[PDB]
Amino acid sequence: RYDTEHLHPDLWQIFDNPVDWKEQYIHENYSRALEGEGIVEQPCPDVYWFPLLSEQMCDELVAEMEHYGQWSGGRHEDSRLAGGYENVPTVDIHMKQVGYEDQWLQLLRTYVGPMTESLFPGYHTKARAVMNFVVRYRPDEQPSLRPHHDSSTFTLNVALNHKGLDYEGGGCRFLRYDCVISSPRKGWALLHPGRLTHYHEGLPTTWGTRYIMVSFVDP
Amino acid sequence: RYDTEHLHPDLWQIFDNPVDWKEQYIHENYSRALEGEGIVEQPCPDVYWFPLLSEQMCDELVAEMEHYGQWSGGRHEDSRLAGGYENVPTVDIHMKQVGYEDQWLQLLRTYVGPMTESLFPGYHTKARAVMNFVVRYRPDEQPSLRPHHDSSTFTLNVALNHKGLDYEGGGCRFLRYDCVISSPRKGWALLHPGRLTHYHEGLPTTWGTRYIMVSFVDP
Ligand SMILES: *[C@@H]1O[C@H](CO)[C@@H](O)[C@H](O)[C@H]1NC(C)=O
Ligand SMILES: *[C@@H]1O[C@H](CO)[C@@H](O)[C@H](O)[C@H]1NC(C)=O
Ligand SMILES: O=C(O)CCC(=O)C(=O)O
Ligand SMILES: O=C(O)CCC(=O)C(=O)O
Ligand SMILES: [Fe+2]
Ligand SMILES: [Fe+2]
């Protein structure tokens, strides 16, 4: 079965041919990082930086999302939320409306779980996520977020476009540690707990346009 | 109204006469530690050490606990748990048996809450807890625990007697930082997240008997 009603219908082949899917899409530095020869960085305590996605994932994903185009979100209330009251709103496209959510849960189950289990010894996961979306920061649509906290055990944060060549801005800002992340990488991911210890704030974009993928796993 | 069918009935006066209850039982230095002129210590990353209970409350609580006698617990399976299986058993007296549950929840709601809201800015608590007990460590019946995690946002650890004078043992040992807590004080408290980034293990006791008090707040 190979449906062709997509710009890149190959992206749906995660179930059918997982090995070639990983070969094409997953960043080539992932396996070496997982087996433990460095690569991963700890810019701040209890924060880790390991590369996950290759450029093809990034460009094809932004292509698909821009093909959808419908940039909902921004209002403090919500209908996608059962409670109907977002703590902070963002202009977002959730994976539920695109139909890609199941593949994303499969990706989180297979290629992120082991990384966290090896990074935090003694922690056991099943990689359950309910809220997952891609956020766009534009200097005119929406500024960066206010300081807040995340309703999940830890949050997976992945960039989607190259800083400088397309946009200029900043990354995260950890208040309690005076930590600033200033140069996000295109193919890397950020892992940090977001319930109690880490009060984080978003740095403001100045020129260009940036895309960020965020997921809440283990709520 | 006054119930005199207790060894120390004044312990149950946290609802009628809050001010005198606080003046007699709560450690005197609590207010100073709350308003922020030191005292509160951070021996290891994201762990805190501030005084909560004075000597009178500790001694009376210990005596009232030992009066009950039935130091149950020890089997891997459980009857006090809805699921019916402990991950790790320890000799404990759940407060629900002795009736002190409501007053303990009141104490957590009144005194701990503001203190933990001050320590971690941007966090809002309701001090709702389900698991709360007192564990007796003894070199004869049960030594210390295997390394593990906790099923709560953060845990409160309070000692109930003096080190060296009545027991010789050890505190906690944090695996991911190589942190050792050498000398617990009598009435002080220990706060630390207990789900993701604190893989802690308790040291074993060799001489005499020691008491600690735990509460898994914010399930
Ligand atoms: C993968 O890591 C190696 C380490 O030497 C590096 O040479 C290579 O450029 C990396 N691949 C990338 C960044 O796509
Ligand atoms: C409370 O702190 C003061 C600090 O000046 C100290 O003098 C006093 O002994 C403390 N109370 C105790 C340890 O019970
Ligand atoms: O959109 C969100 O609320 C999560 C993203 C966030 O706060 C962050 O990127 O740190
Ligand atoms: O037995 C337990 O789980 C409570 C005791 C504990 O975790 C500790 O001693 O730190
Ligand atoms: Fe966040
Ligand atoms: Fe514990």
Curated annotation (Swiss-Prot), chains A, B:
Fe cation binds at residues 148, 150, 200. Homodimer. Disulfide bonds join 44-179. The N-terminal domain mediates glycosyltransferase activity. The C-terminal domain that mediates lysyl hydroxylase activity is also important for homodimerization. Residues 128-219 form the Fe2OG dioxygenase domain. Residues 153-196 are annotated as: Important for dimerization. Ubiquitous. Detected in heart, placenta and pancreas and at lower levels in lung, liver and skeletal muscle. It comes from the Eukaryota. Glycans are attached at residue 29. This is Multifunctional procollagen lysine hydroxylase and glycosyltransferase LH3. 2-oxoglutarate binds at residues 80, 137, 157, 210. It is found in: Rough endoplasmic reticulum; Endoplasmic reticulum lumen; Endoplasmic reticulum membrane; Secreted. Multifunctional enzyme that catalyzes a series of essential post-translational modifications on Lys residues in procollagen. Plays a redundant role in catalyzing the formation of hydroxylysine residues in -Xaa-Lys-Gly- sequences in collagens. Plays a redundant role in catalyzing the transfer of galactose onto hydroxylysine groups, giving rise to galactosyl 5-hydroxylysine. Has an essential role by catalyzing the subsequent transfer of glucose moieties, giving rise to 1,2-glucosylgalactosyl-5-hydroxylysine residues. It is linked to BCARD syndrome: An autosomal recessive connective tissue disorder, secondary to lysyl hydroxylase 3 deficiency. It is characterized by congenital malformations severely affecting multiple tissues and organs. Clinical features include growth retardation, craniofacial dysmorphism, popliteal and cerebral aneurysm, cerebral arterial hemorrhage, skin blistering and easy bruisability, and osteopenia. Changing residue 196 to R: Loss of lysyl hydroxylase activity and decreased glycosyltransferase activity.
